[PDB]
Design a protein around this nucleic acid. Structure first.
Lengths: 121, 362, 263, 718
DNA sequence: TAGGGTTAGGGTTAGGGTTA
């Protein structure tokens, strides 16, 4: 059995605020599909800032690509020497039309409740 | 202190016992079991027998007769067990009329719809309903029912994981239920806390003591001189509420005891257990259960159909019976007393009730 | 007349029926739906089924307070869980809840006479001619579900088109099924408790095609006017780990169906 | 009859004591644990008859048998602490652990000894145990309780009724002596007499007076199924009343004293015109039921006033009992408990597949079903009531479907015909049961077994055998545990000449008697066929126990039964006796033979409490060995065997003269008995011309010889 | 004299440790 997948907004993982080898699930919008090297570069906006996450895909071929669309990625993170941070994909589904603010508020509320229950112990 | 789990004899009083609870998977992993009954689990005073989970499948394994599934709900992972229901003896159709052909076509459509709905692959969304079992020192979820959820936009999962904390904060993170009240077993000595409650409690005790002796005629002072009745009445609360006179503290306490005894007596009277007579005695009453002559009179009048004609429907209503009994014997007859008389007559297999408030003879 | 009380003692008033006979009292002016009225000195009696209602006697005074509004407005029923009905603190009798169907108990379909309501056969009554001057048949349907919302469990009964709505079938399918069952005359499926139709319904009733999350608008089955406290806890022998044990249980709630919608 | 005095009977001890013949026993541990209700009949001199009496006994103390360990064993580390075991140490550990964690206040302990020879392992054959006596008010100790000095405790969940009856050596319904009578303030039953008994030791067994006459009631009804919701309903009542039916002779005449009926109408149809006038003209004692609640109330009131003891009918448990209960519950008939004898309101949950609640609710009276009685008495072509009437009364029985029932309400005379049909059916069933004399046979069976009278009426041979074993082992100071065929292929051929068929008698009892098959005399150390783990296709059957060993326990009882049967068959040959005495002897022997048959089924049935697979396997092996030996030695005499089954074997004769068949059968009997003296064979029948068709099918002209040396050929097919 | 029919109903169990 594997470890569970905790949610993480793109900008935190972009800054490397998670330990190496952790399992995380995040979101973003695809920007490029490097065919030969099996690499995916998705992007997510934050005000005037744009953040990039590198996704290895060696475990989900065959895989259709939808340029300029949202995605959900779940897997493990490995801190490479030069490439930086890349997530090893285990499941990679596509969702469209789902509004970000509801999701962001949802994880914020869940984190708040978890911390509140953590105040008794 | 050793936290004692609630006794198994009161589990069902909770409304959660028969329901399908929604829990975080980490909670169901980390929440303890119960020693007195293995197979069921206890969480924060609320016993839980059935759970409901939803998430993304990340592990598939097949066996001879049962599947295997590893679900994830963003906080933990648990195994799932789904038995392969035997579709033995496949039904063979017959060349009946066109209606049966259409019905068989619809049956095939339903079968293929179910087969498509139950197909599961890695990366889908699964919903599971069932109980908890522990095998090989690990926790699993037996599945009573399960099906794939089609959510291409992530609406249902967002709604679920927004709704759940409200469910916790409103139901689960609360002390306990409210069943069998508290201290209602007896009254923690006859002292109690409410004087009307003390009178009410004295009422049935006096009634039972009168019943034990099979009393047919009694006087209020005869019941007041009873030491047990006084001891039941003499409570710390009644002494504080008996402050009406100072120069006659003993006399006013006796008056208060007389008042509470009379209140119990009139409470019994309102139940029809004891009636009243015009014999010049203020504190004289007779138990209606032992008035054999009255029972015989009512049985005779019911046999005669309460003066109603035979050619009409046999028997009479409660109101007409009450009027006939009042006019035939005593204008002072009370309606609860006649209800008790009719019930006692029915107890002795004297009459039969076709329906409510309508009794016939044989 | 069906009136709803209003008092400060209880914030969930109970319904009540007022009967005005007319051997000596034609109705007075102003009595219309949606108009507040005041009553005084009415006669109370107990029904055969232990109901409370007021008879209208010669010692009754009627006073009209306010006129009906020019437009009729509606207020959605409050949303609540099924658990709060078991706590004696101010529980409503009409509400809506989000629940999920577990299983079914029985399903009944009818084709009754237009006049004597006896079971019809291909458009003719069993007692046709003796008590039937015409030939017309009207269909009826009865179902009994068992739903759960997340914190309790209750049984829900539906009638007429509500069963068709609850089975998730288009009106064409319902009409076709009623026409198909119109020939035999009667179908009773004591599926729980104490011919291709049988297997078809057995397959349908125990599939996820029906067991779906639904939004229910339910009315308490026991009418609020009725009063009958006679329920001590029972005892049964639920067992999970191959070891029976005894525990007391509350009586099951009874409800009625008003509207069922998907989600 | 005043209720403030008890009709005590003075005895030799100058004490006004109570003598009564108990019939039924009841208990309720979930509500009033340690409370036992007893029902019976007590003679009344003022009324010159017997009335129902209620006696209930309180203050029942539980009995435990702790199983001590030879060596101290730690309960947390599972290792020996290096100290021996003494009774005082066991008592101290019990007091400081069991009573502390289980809240036990009152307890009586004393070292005792018992015998164990059951299939439960981890128990020494003989040891000095401890008896702990405590009330049932405190919680029962866990059944698998283990301690430092004790490894087990016996009798954890045994019923209080069983211990109460067994501590006084009671064998079924019998006269009893009741001392120290106490009055009851609040009656709780419908019996005329109610008694309050304080201690279980106030009873002694009396067996010197014949039981008094009882009340037997036979009744039936008609059922109509609603079309709208498939809700069945009951239409009419009909019953035949007998007051003082004897229980020690044949069926008296007349078998009834009065009969009554009442009928109602459905929710749509109406009664025929002037039904009251038609009844008056006909002058028939039939009541008209206005409503279903009315008929239910009238029927229950009539039953309560009559207060019957034995009730009978057709398939009552299967359909009628639960139909009546459902109708009562739906109609909300007040005081449903009047059908039985205890005043109750909490009816047990109906619809149980096993029907446990159905028999629980029917406490206080004796219920008999004709179907089970016919199944256990003789063999019939079919169990349908019309078939039984044809086999006995040879009378046609009308089956009326609902098509005639719906229009049956047209005329009053038609309803009179229908109710006459129902009354005739009830009379026919009553005659069928009375000529069979099932009730005296059941009474004799209960007296022989000593078990509960009611449990015999359901055909529970396993229960009666278990209770007989319990009596036998308690009389030998034993502890009992708690509660949760070869087909022969001989030479194949068809022979149309005479075929002589024989069948052995009590093959399994003979095997047990010859080889001393008993729990206390059979060990389980072998590798023959049955009891070994799944290591290959080889397992263990116990070998033949040594005949030189001490003779067993159960063979002693079966030998006693055989001796009693031999004494009976010696007694019946004497002439100049009353016919009722001859009938009693015949039913007694037949009860003995059925008991002998049930001896094997005691352990053959899987659901036995004392089920022992090794003994059953040994019995099967011995039966197969005896069958093969008999077939071989018969065929050595130039007598080809065409078929055989366990103990019923027929030998091909290929002859025509009946004298040769008789002589050959006698010679075969002489030959077979030589090896087994206890096992004997009997002439089952002779076939004039047998033809074989297929499996379980044969055509033959059965031989039924007369006293003139000739025979009549009668054809039988199946 | 005012509700319809009033009926209590599903309340078990199923086995890992495997490749061309």
């Amino acid at each position: 059995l594997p470890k569970p997948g905790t949610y993480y907004l793109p900008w935190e993982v972009s800054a490397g605020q998670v330990p190496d080898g952790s399992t995380l699930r995040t979101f973003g919008r695809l920007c490029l599909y490097d065919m030969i090297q099996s690499r995916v570069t998705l992007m997510a906006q934050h005000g005037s800032d744009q953040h990039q996450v590198l996704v290895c895909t060696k475990l989900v071929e065959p895989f259709h690509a939808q340029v300029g669309s949202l995605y959900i990625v779940l897997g493990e993170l490995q801190h490479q020497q030069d490439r930086g941070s890349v997530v090893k994909a285990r499941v990679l589904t596509c969702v469209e039309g789902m509004n970000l603010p509801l999701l962001e508020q949802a994880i914020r509320e869940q984190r708040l409740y978890k911390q509140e229950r953590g105040g008794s112990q | 202190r050793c936290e004692e789990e609630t006794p198994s004899l009161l589990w069902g009083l909770d409304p959660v016992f028969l329901a399908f609870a929604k829990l975080y998977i980490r909670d169901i992993l980390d929440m303890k079991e119960s020693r007195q009954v293995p197979g069921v689990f206890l969480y924060n005073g609320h016993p839980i027998k059935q759970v409901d989970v939803l998430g993304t499948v990340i592990g598939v394994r097949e066996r001879d007769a049962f599947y295997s599934y590893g679900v994830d709900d963003s906080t933990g992972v648990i195994n799932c067990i789904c038995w392969k229901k035997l579709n033995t003896e496949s039904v063979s159709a017959a060349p009946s009329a066109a209606r049966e052909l259409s019905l068989t076509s619809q049956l095939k459509k339903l079968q293929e719809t179910i087969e498509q709905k139950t197909k599961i692959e890695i990366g889908d969304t699964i919903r599971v309903r069932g109980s908890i079992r522990t095998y090989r020192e690990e926790r699993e979820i037996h599945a009573t029912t399960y099906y794939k959820v089609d959510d291409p936009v992530w609406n249902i999962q967002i709604a679920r994981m927004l709704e759940l904390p409200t469910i916790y904060r409103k139901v689960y993170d609360q002390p306990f239920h409210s069943s069998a009240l508290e201290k209602e077993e007896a009254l923690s000595n006859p002292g109690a806390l409410d004087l009307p409650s003390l009178t009410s409690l004295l009422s049935e005790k006096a009634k039972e003591f009168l019943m034990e002796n099979r009393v047919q005629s009694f006087y209020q002072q005869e019941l007041e001189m009873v030491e047990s009745l006084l001891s039941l009445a003499n409570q710390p609360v009644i002494h504080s509420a008996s402050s009406d006179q100072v120069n006659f503290k003993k006399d006013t306490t006796s008056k208060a005891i007389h008042s509470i005894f009379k209140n119990a007596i009139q409470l019994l009277q309102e139940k029809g257990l004891v009636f009243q007579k015009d014999d010049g005695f203020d504190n004289l009453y007779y138990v209606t259960r032992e008035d054999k002559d009255l029972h015989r009179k009512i049985h005779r009048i019911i046999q005669q159909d309460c003066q109603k004609p035979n050619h009409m429907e046999k028997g009479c209503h409660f109101l007409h019976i009450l009027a006939c009994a009042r006019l035939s014997i005593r204008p002072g007859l009370s309606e609860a007393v006649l209800q008790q008389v009719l019930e006692l007559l029915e107890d002795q297999s004297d009459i039969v009730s076709t329906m409510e408030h309508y009794y016939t003879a044989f | 007349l069906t009136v709803a009380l209003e008092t400060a003692e209880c914030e969930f008033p109970p319904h009540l029926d007022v009967y005005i006979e007319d051997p000596h009292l034609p109705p007075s002016l102003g009595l219309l739906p949606g108009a507040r009225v005041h009553f005084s000195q009415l006669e109370k009696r107990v029904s055969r089924s232990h109901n409370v209602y007021c008879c209208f006697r010669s010692s009754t005074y009627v006073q009209v307070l306010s006129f009906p509004p020019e437009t009729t407005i509606s207020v959605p029923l409050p949303h609540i869980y099924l658990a709060e009905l078991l706590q004696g603190g101010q529980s409503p009798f009409q509400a809506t809840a989000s629940c999920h169907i577990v299983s079914v108990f029985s399903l009944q379909l009818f084709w009754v006479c237009a006049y004597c309501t006896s079971i019809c056969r291909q458009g003719k009554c069993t007692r046709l001619g003796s008590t039937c001057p015409t030939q017309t048949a009207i269909s009826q349907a009865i179902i009994r579900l068992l739903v759960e919302d997340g914190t309790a469990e209750a049984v829900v009964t539906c009638r007429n088109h509500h069963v068709a709505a609850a089975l998730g079938l288009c009106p064409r399918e319902w009409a076709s099924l009623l026409d198909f069952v119109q020939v035999p005359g009667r179908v009773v499926l004591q599926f729980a408790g104490p011919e291709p139709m049988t297997m078809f319904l057995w397959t349908l009733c125990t599939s996820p095609s029906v067991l779906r999350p639904i939004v229910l608008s339910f009315e308490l089955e026991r009418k609020p006017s009725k009063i009958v406290p006679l329920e001590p806890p029972r005892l049964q022998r639920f067992q999970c780990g191959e070891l029976p044990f005894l525990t007391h249980v509350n009586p099951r709630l009874r409800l009625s169906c008003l509207s069922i919608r998907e989600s | 009859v005043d209720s403030s005095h008890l009709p005590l009977v003075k005895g030799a001890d100058e004490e006004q004591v109570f003598h009564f013949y108990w019939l039924d026993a009841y208990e309720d541990q979930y509500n009033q644990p340690g409370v036992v209700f007893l029902f019976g009949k007590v003679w009344i001199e003022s009324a010159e008859t017997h009335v129902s009496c209620c006696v209930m006994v309180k203050n029942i103390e539980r009995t435990l048998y702790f199983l001590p360990r030879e060596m101290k064993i730690d309960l947390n580390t599972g290792k020996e602490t290096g100290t021996p075991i003494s009774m005082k140490d066991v008592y101290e550990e019990f007091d400081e652990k069991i009573a502390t964690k289980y809240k036990i206040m009152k307890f009586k302990s004393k070292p005792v000894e018992k015998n164990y020879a059951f299939e439960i392992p981890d128990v020494p054959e003989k040891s000095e145990y401890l008896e702990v006596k405590y009330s049932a008010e405190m919680p029962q100790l866990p059944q698998d309780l283990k301690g430092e000095t004790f490894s087990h405790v016996f009798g954890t969940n045994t019923s209080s009724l069983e211990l109460f009856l067994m501590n006084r050596k009671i064998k079924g319904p019998c006269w009893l002596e009741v001392k120290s009578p106490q009055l009851l303030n609040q009656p709780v039953s419908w019996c005329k007499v109610e008694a309050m008994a304080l201690k279980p030791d106030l009873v002694n067994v009396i067996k010197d007076v014949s039981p008094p006459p009882l009340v037997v009631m036979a009744f039936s009804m008609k059922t109509m199924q609603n079309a709208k919701n498939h809700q069945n309903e009951i239409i009419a009542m009909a019953a035949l009343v007998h007051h003082s039916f004897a229980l020690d002779k044949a069926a008296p005449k007349p078998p009834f004293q009065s009969h009554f009926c009442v009928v109602s109408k459905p929710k749509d149809c109406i009664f025929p015109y002037a039904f009251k006038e038609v009844i008056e003209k006909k002058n028939v004692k039939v009541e008209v039921a206005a409503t279903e609640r009315t008929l239910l109330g009238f029927f229950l009131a009539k039953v309560h006033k009559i207060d019957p003891d034995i009730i009978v009918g057709h398939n009552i448990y299967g359909f009628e009992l639960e139909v009546l209960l459902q109708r009562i519950n739906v109609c909300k008939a007040p005081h449903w408990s009047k059908i039985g004898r205890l005043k109750r309101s909490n009816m047990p949950k109906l619809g149980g597949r096993s029907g446990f609640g159905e028999r629980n609710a029917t406490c206080g009276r004796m219920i008999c079903d004709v179907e089970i009685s016919a199944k256990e008495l003789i063999r019939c072509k079919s169990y349908h009531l019309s078939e039984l009437v044809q086999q006995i009364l040879k009378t046609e029985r009308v089956v009326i479907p609902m098509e005639n029932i719906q229009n049956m309400y047209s005329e009053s005379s038609q309803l009179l015909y229908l109710l006459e049909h129902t009354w005739k059916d009830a009379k026919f069933i009553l005659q069928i049961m009375c000529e069979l004399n099932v009730l005296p046979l059941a009474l004799q069976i209960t007296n022989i077994a000593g078990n509960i009278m009611s449990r015999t009426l359901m055909g529970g041979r396993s229960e009666r055998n278990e209770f007989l074993l319990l009596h036998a082992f308690y009389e030998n100071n034993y502890i009992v545990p708690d509660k949760q065929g070869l087909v022969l292929d001989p030479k194949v051929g068809f022979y149309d000449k005479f075929i002589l068929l024989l069948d052995f008698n009590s093959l399994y009892p003979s095997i047990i008697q010859e080889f001393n098959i008993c729990f206390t005399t059979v060990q389980r150390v072998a590798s023959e066929a049955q009891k070994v783990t799944e290591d290959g296709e080889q397992e263990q059957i116990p070998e033949l126990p040594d005949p030189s060993l001490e003779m067993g326990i159960l063979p002693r009882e079966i030998r006693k039964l055989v001796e009693r049967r031999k004494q009976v068959k010696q007694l019946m040959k004497q002439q100049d006796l009353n016919p009722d005495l001859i009938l009693q002897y015949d039913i007694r022997q037949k009860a003995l033979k059925l008991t002998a048959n049930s001896m094997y089924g005691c352990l053959g049935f899987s659901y036995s409490r004392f089920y022992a697979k090794p003994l059953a396997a040994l019995v099967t092996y011995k039966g197969r060995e005896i069958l093969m030996h008999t077939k071989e030695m018969v065929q050595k005499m130039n007598l080809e065997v065409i078929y055989g089954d366990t103990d019923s074997i027929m030998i091909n004769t290929n002859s025509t003269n009946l004298e040769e068949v008789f002589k050959l059968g006698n010679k075969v009997k002489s030959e077979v008995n030589k090896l087994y003296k206890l096992l004997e064979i009997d002439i089952d029948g002779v076939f004039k011309s047998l033809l074989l068709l297929k499996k379980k099918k044969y055509a033959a002209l059965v031989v039924e010889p007369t006293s003139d040396g000739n025979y009549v050929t009668k054809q039988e097919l199946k």
